[PDB]
Symmetry: C2
Subunit: 208 residues, 2 copies
Amino acid sequence: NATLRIAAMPALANGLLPRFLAQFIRDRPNLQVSLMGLPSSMVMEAVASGRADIGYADGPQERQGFLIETRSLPAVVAVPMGHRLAGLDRVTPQDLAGERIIKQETGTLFAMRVEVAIGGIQRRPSIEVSLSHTALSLVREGAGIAIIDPAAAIEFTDRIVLRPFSIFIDAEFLEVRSAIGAPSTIVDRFTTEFWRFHDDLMKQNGLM
Amino acid sequence: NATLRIAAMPALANGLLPRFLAQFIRDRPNLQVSLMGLPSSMVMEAVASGRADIGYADGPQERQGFLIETRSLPAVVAVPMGHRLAGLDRVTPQDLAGERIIKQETGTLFAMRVEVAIGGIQRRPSIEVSLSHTALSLVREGAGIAIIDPAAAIEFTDRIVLRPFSIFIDAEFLEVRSAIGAPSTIVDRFTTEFWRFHDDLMKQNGLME
């Protein structure tokens, strides 16, 4: 009960999770925590094999053998400060014509659906990245714009403007636990308080 | 129709490279760039197979068949803003006594050597991570301390403090190119201009002398 082993996709594992963990451990100085950043596929493996107590991954995943909590967050467009797209309430694919859109080969279903959504839109030669965080870094430095999940965006909210994407595309987050896992109060408390933290943070910023 | 393909380890791929890339591409409007984050082992394969023009990996690495430029910088101690250790000139292992030191299990020789250097110090039950960026996030959020390479932590210096580590553990960065690969002026430009960008920034913060 003084053990908390977490496996998560690098998205949450590098943003919202360390942020919430910092608050969660204030009560518990003797708590031994492991926060491992893994691909979504290996996150499922870590939970199933018992190497991790909680798993966080990108949907979709096969549910057999797992207890799963889910969230769906609409796609948003991230633009530099003062960019003309900040003048809109809702950004369409056509509004991206002639922009330098950062392409994200992250391997998620979300990223793929996003790229086809803007498949016929004229654009300048891209910068193709492999991480959502890297894309946002380039937008912050003014190298272009990106289409993302809002959870990845929230730690860039000061130097970057967000707008809802006109195409209805949701990013699905999974909280994963083993259906035959060991009863744990600390895991119950963490998973419960994290979603509350997540939901409150997203709703406060008009992202949910 | 020039395309630049760069594979890099988390240390440079997450911070310094994107920041430099934004500057490098602004007056090259029709230049197409790919920046793929990969493990150091996969970076070597990316360069060896031609799937990447330039490679950036942790050291040491199998040199045979490559053209490699080397950087080596001392390990620094990353503490939260206003932490007690921020008032010290150098941080000794004994100075880290009773501190929450985020354990980094990244597979690098640097991180492994680091964990050996502080294995004789009694730490609080810390937080284990597999990503150096996760450790830096935790330091920023005030969750603990971390010994890390300066080039990966330089992007976090807005909210964290870097102090010299009294044990001289050097992180080795490699610029990797195919010895067989055809000559390229855009690559010659990027590689040398990046190192000047890297060196200047490290010197500006006393992380390089």
